[PDB]
Short mmCIF file of C-alpha atoms and ligand atoms in Angstrom, two decimals:
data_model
loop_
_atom_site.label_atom_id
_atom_site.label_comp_id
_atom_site.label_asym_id
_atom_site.label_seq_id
_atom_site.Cartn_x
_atom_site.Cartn_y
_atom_site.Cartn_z
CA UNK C 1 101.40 130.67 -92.92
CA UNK C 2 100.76 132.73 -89.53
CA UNK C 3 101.98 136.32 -89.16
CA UNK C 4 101.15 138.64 -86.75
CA UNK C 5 101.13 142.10 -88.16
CA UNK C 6 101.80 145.06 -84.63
CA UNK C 7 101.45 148.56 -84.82
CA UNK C 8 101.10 151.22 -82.29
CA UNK C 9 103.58 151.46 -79.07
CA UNK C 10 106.89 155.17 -79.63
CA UNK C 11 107.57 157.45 -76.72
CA UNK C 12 104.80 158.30 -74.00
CA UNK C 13 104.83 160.75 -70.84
CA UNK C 14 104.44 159.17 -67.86
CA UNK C 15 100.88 158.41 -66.93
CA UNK C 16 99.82 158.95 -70.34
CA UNK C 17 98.31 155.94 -72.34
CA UNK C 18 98.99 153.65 -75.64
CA UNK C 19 97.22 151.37 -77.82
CA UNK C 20 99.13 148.06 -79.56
CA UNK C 21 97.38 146.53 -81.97
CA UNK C 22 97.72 142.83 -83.11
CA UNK C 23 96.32 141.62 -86.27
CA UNK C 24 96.93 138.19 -87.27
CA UNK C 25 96.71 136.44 -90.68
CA UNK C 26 96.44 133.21 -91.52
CA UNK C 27 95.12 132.47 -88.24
CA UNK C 28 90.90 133.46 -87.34
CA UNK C 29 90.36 134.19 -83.76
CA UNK C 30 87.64 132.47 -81.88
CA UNK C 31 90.13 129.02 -80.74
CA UNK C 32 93.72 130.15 -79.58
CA UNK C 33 95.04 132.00 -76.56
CA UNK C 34 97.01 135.37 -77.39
CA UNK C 35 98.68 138.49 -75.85
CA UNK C 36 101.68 140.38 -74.65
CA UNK C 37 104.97 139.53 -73.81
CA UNK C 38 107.32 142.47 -73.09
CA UNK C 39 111.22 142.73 -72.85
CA UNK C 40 112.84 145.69 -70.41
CA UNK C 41 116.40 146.31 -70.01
CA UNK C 42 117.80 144.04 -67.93
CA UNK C 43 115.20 141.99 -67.69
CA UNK C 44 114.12 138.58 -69.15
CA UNK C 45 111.15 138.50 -71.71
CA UNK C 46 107.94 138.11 -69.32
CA UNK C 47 104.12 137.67 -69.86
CA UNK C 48 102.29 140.53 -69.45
CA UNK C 49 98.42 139.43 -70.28
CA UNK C 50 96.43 136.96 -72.52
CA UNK C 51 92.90 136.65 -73.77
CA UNK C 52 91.32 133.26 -74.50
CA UNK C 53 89.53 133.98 -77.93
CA UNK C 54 87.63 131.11 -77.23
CA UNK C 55 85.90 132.42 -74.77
CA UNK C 56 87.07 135.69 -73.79
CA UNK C 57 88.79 134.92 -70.20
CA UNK C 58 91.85 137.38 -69.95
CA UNK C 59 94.83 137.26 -67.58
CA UNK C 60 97.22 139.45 -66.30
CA UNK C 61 100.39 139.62 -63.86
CA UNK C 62 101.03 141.54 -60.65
CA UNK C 63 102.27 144.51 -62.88
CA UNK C 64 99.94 145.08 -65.53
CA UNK C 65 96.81 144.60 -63.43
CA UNK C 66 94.17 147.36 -63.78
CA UNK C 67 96.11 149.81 -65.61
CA UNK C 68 96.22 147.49 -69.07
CA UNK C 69 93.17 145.76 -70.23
CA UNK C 70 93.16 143.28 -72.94
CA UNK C 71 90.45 142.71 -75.26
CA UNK C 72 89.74 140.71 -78.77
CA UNK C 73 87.66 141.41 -81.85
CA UNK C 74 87.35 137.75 -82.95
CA UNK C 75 85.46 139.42 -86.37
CA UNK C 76 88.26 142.09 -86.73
CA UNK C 77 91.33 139.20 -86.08
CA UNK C 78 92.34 141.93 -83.88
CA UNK C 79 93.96 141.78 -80.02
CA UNK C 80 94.31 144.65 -78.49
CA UNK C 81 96.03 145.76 -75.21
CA UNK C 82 95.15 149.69 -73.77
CA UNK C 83 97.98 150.56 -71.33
CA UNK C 84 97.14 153.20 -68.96
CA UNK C 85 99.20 154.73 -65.94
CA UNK C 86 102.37 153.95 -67.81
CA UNK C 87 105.46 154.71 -65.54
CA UNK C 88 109.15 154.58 -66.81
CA UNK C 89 109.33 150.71 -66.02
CA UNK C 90 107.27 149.89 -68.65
CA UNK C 91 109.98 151.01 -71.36
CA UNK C 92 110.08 147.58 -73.42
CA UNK C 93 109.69 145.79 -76.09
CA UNK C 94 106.80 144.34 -76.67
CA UNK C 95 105.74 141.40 -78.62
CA UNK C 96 102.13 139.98 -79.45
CA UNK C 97 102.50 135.84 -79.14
CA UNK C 98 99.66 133.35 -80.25
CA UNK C 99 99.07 129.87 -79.21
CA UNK C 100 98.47 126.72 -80.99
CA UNK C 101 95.54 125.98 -78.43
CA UNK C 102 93.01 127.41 -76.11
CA UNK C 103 94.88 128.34 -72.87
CA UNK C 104 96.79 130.95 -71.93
CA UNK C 105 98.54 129.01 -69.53
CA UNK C 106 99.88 126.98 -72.49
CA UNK C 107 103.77 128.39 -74.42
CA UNK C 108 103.27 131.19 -77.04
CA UNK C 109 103.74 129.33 -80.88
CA UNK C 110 104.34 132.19 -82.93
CA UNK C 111 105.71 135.79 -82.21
CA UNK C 112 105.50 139.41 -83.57
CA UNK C 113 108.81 141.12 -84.57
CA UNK C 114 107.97 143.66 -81.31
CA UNK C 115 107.32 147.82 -80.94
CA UNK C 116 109.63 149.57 -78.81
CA UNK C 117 107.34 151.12 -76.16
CA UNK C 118 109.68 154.08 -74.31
CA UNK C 119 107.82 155.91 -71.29
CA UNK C 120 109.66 159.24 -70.00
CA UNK C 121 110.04 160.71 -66.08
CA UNK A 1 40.18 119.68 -79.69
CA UNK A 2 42.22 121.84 -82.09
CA UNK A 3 45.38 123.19 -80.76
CA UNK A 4 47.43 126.26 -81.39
CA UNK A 5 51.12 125.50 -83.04
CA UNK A 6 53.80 126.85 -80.32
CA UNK A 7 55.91 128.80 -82.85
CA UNK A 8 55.90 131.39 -79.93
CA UNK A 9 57.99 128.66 -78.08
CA UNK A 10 60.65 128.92 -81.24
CA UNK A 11 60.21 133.03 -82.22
CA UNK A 12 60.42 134.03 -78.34
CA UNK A 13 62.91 131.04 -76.98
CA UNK A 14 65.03 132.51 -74.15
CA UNK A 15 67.88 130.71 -75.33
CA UNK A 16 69.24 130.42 -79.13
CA UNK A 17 71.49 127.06 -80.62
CA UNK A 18 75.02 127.57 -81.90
CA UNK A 19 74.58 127.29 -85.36
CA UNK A 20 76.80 124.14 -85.47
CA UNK A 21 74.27 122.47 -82.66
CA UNK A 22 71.31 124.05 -84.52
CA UNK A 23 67.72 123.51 -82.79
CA UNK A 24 65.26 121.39 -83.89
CA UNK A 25 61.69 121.80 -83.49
CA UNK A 26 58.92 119.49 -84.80
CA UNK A 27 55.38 121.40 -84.95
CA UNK A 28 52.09 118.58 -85.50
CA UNK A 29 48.54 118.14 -84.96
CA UNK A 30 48.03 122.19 -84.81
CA UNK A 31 46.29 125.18 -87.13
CA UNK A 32 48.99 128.36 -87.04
CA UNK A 33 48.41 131.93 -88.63
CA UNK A 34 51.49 132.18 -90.96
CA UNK A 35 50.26 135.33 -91.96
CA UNK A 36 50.92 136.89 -88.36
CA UNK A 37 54.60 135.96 -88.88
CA UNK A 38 54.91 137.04 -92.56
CA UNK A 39 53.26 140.69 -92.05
CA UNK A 40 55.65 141.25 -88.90
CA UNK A 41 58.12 144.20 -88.88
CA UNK A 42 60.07 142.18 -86.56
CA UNK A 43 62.23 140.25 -89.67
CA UNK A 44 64.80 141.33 -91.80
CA UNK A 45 64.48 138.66 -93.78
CA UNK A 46 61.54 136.25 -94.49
CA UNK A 47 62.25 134.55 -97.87
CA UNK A 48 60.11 131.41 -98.81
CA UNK A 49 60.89 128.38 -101.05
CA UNK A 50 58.56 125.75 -103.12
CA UNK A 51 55.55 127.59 -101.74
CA UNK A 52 53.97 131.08 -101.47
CA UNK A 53 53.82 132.92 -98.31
CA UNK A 54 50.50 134.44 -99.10
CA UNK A 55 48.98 131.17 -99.41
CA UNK A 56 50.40 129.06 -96.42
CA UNK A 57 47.10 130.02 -94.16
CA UNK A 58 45.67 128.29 -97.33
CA UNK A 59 47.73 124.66 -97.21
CA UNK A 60 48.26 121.44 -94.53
CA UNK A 61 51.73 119.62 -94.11
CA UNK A 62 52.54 116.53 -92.80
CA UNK A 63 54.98 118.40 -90.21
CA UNK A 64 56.40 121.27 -89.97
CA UNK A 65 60.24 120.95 -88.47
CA UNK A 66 61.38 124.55 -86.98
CA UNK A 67 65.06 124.92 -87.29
CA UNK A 68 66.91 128.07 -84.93
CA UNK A 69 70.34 129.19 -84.33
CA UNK A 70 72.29 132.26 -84.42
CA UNK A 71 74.86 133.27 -86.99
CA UNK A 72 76.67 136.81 -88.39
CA UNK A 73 74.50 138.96 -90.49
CA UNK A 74 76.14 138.79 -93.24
CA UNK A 75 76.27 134.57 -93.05
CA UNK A 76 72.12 135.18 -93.51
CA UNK A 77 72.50 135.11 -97.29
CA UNK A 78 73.96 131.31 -96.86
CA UNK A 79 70.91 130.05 -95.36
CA UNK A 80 69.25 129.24 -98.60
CA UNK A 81 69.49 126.33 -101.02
CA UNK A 82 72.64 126.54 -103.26
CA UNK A 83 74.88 128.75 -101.05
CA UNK A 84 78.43 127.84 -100.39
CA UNK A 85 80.29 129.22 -97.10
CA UNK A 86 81.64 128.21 -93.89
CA UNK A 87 77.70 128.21 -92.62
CA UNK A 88 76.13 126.58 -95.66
CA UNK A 89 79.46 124.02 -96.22
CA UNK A 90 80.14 122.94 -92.33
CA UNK A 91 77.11 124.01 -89.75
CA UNK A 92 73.59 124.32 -91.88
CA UNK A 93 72.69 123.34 -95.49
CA UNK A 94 69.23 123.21 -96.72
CA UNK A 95 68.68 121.18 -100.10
CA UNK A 96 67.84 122.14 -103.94
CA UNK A 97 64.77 121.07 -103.70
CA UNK A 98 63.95 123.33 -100.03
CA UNK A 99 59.82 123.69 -99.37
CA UNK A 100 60.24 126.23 -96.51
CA UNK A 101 60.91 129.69 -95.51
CA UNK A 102 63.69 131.49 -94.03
CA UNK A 103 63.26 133.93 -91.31
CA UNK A 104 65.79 136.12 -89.68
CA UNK A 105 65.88 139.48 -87.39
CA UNK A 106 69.49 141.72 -85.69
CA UNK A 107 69.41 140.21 -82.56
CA UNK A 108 72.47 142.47 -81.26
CA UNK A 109 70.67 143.77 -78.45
CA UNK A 110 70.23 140.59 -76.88
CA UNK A 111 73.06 138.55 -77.95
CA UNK A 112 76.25 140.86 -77.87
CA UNK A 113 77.31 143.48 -74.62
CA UNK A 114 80.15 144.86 -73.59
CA UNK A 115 82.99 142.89 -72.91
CA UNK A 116 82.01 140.54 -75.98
CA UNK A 117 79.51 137.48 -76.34
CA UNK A 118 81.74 134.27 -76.58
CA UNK A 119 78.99 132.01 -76.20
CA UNK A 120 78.36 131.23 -79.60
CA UNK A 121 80.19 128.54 -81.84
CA UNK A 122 80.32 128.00 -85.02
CA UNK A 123 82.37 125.39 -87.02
CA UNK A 124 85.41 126.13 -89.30
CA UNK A 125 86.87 122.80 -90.77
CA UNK A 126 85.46 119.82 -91.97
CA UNK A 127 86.88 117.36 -94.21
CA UNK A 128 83.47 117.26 -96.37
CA UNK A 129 80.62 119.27 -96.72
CA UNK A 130 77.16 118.50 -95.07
CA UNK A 131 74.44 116.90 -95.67
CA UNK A 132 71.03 118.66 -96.13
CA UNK A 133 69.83 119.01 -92.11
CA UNK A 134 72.66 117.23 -91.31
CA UNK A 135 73.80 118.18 -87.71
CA UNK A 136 77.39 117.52 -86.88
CA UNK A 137 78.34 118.07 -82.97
CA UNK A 138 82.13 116.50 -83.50
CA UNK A 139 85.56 117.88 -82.17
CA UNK A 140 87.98 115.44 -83.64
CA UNK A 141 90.78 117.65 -84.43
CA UNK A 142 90.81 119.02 -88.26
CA UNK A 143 94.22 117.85 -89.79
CA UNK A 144 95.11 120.96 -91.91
CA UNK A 145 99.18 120.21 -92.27
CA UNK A 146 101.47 117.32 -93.47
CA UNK A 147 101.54 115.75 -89.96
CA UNK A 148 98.56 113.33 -88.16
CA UNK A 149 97.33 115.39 -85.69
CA UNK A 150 97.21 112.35 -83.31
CA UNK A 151 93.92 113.80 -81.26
CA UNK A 152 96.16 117.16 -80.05
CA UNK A 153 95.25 120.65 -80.59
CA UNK A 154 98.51 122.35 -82.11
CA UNK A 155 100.58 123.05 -85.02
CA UNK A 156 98.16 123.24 -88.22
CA UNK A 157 95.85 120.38 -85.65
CA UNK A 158 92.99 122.44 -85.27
CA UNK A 159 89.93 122.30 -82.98
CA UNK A 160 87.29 122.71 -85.38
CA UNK A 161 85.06 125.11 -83.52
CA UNK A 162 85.12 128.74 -83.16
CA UNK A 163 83.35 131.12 -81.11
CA UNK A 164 82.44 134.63 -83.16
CA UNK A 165 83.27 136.83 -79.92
CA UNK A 166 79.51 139.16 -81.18
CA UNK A 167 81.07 142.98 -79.98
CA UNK A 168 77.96 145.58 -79.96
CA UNK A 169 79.93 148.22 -81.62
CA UNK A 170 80.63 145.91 -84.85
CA UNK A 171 78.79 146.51 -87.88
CA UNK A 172 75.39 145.25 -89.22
CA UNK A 173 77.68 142.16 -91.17
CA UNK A 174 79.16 141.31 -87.84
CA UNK A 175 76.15 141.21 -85.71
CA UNK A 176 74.51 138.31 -84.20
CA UNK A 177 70.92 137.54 -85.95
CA UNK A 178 68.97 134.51 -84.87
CA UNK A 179 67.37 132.40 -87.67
CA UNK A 180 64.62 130.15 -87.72
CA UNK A 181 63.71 128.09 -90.96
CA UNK A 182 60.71 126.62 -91.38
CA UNK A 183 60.57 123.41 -93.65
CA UNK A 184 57.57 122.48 -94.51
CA UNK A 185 56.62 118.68 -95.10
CA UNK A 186 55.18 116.93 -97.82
CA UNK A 187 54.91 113.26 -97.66
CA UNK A 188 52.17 111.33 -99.16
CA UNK A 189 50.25 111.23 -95.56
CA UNK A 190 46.98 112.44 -93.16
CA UNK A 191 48.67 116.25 -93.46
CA UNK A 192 47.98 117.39 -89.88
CA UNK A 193 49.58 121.42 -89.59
CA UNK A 194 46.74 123.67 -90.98
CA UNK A 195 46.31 127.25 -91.78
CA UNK A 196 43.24 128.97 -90.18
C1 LIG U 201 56.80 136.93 -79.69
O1 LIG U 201 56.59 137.89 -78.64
C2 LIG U 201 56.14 139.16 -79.09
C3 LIG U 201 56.22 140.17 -77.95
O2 LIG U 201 55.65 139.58 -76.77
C4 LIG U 201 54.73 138.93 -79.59
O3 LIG U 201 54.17 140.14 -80.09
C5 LIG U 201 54.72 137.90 -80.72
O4 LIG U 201 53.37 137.52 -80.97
C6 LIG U 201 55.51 136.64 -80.40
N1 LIG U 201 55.83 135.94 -81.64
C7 LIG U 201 55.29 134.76 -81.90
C8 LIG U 201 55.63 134.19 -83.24
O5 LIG U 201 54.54 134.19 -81.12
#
């Protein structure tokens, strides 16, 4: 069975950086979409990028633009997701998802148990 | 009228197969140095079966078909007769009785960079094994689960391709090496690919 295995993510300055890992079993990358959903107070769960391990296409929103970058190691069954220029607003939760096809675009399948990420003033 | 095999057209392509939609090659009706290729520091691996590389500027064939693709260094060792793997089981499979040699060189400079190489595929699932230089260039979705897959990607319903994503800073096993085997025919014919 799938299971996607996170570690990284604790308290950060603001402006400082992180590094979330995803490693999934079960599963080889190379087919599926996966990436980042987050959950801040007050807020509903949102996406906050994807990678296509088919073919290496990423996408982001508005937010996360620039400052995180998402990348796979297909050999490694490894996503990462490098978040720079972290400001207080990105204190979440956040939760690798993977797909059951190809596209981003498509509704994560399975889900992480999520890191607390906590960025301070 | 004697011409020159083009095995520069196979060793120096621009442009490798996916090892699931290998290359084929047929070389004819031409005299090649084999020796040139064996005493080249440009392979890692040049590994002949059925015959002797020293003698091949020695022999004629009735053909000689020129198989390239590009697969993980460490998938090299399955490119020989009686290997088992996702390479030798689902993409490429030579036979017991192989006359031919295996040739093989890193090829991370060209066919990894930053960012990743997606570009090559290889196949995952497959409800049998191949066939000796059988080529299969399906996508019917792999049924890995209890329920029909129905033609849609999805729960255990798996597309049966993958692409190995080459990144440069990987190790030797991870990196992208292209492969070109050489089988060497033998039918009882006019044998028309010479030595010098
Ligand atoms: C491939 O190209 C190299 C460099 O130009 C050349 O030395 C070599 O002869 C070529 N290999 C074959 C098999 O023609």
């Amino acid at each position: 069975q799938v299971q996607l295995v996170e570690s990284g993510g604790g308290s950060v300055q603001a402006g400082g950086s992180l590094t979330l890992s995803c490693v999934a079993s079960g599963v080889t990358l190379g087919r599926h979409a996966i990436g980042w959903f987050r959950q801040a107070p007050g807020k509903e769960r949102e996406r906050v990028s994807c990678i296509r391990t088919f073919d290496g296409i990423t996408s982001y929103v508005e937010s996360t633009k620039g400052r995180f970058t998402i990348s796979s190691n297909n050999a490694m069954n490894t996503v990462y997701l490098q978040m720079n220029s972290l400001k207080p607003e990105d204190t979440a939760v956040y939760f690798c998802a993977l797909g059951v096809t190809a596209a981003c675009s498509d509704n994560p399948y399975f889900w992480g148990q999520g890191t607390q990420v906590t960025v301070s003033s | 009228i004697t011409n020159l095999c083009p095995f520069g057209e196979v060793f120096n392509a621009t442009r490798f197969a996916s090892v699931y939609a290998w290359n084929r090659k047929r070389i004819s009706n031409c005299v090649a140095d084999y020796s040139v290729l064996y005493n080249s520091a440009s392979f890692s691996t040049f590994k002949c079966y059925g015959v002797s590389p020293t003698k091949l500027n020695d022999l004629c064939f009735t053909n000689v078909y020129a198989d390239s693709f590009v697969i993980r260094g460490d998938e090299v060792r399955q490119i020989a007769p009686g290997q088992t793997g996702k390479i030798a089981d689902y993409n490429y499979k030579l036979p017991d009785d192989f006359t031919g040699c295996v040739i093989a060189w890193n090829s991370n400079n060209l066919d990894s960079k930053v960012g990743g190489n997606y570009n090559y595929l290889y196949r995952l699932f497959r409800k049998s094994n191949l066939k000796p230089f059988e080529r299969d260039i399906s996508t019917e979705i792999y049924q890995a689960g209890s329920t029909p897959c129905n033609g849609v990607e999805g729960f255990n319903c798996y597309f049966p391709l993958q692409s190995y994503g080459f990144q440069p800073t990987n190790g030797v096993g991870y990196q992208p090496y292209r492969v070109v085997v050489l089988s060497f025919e033998l039918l009882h014919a006019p044998a028309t690919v010479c030595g010098p």
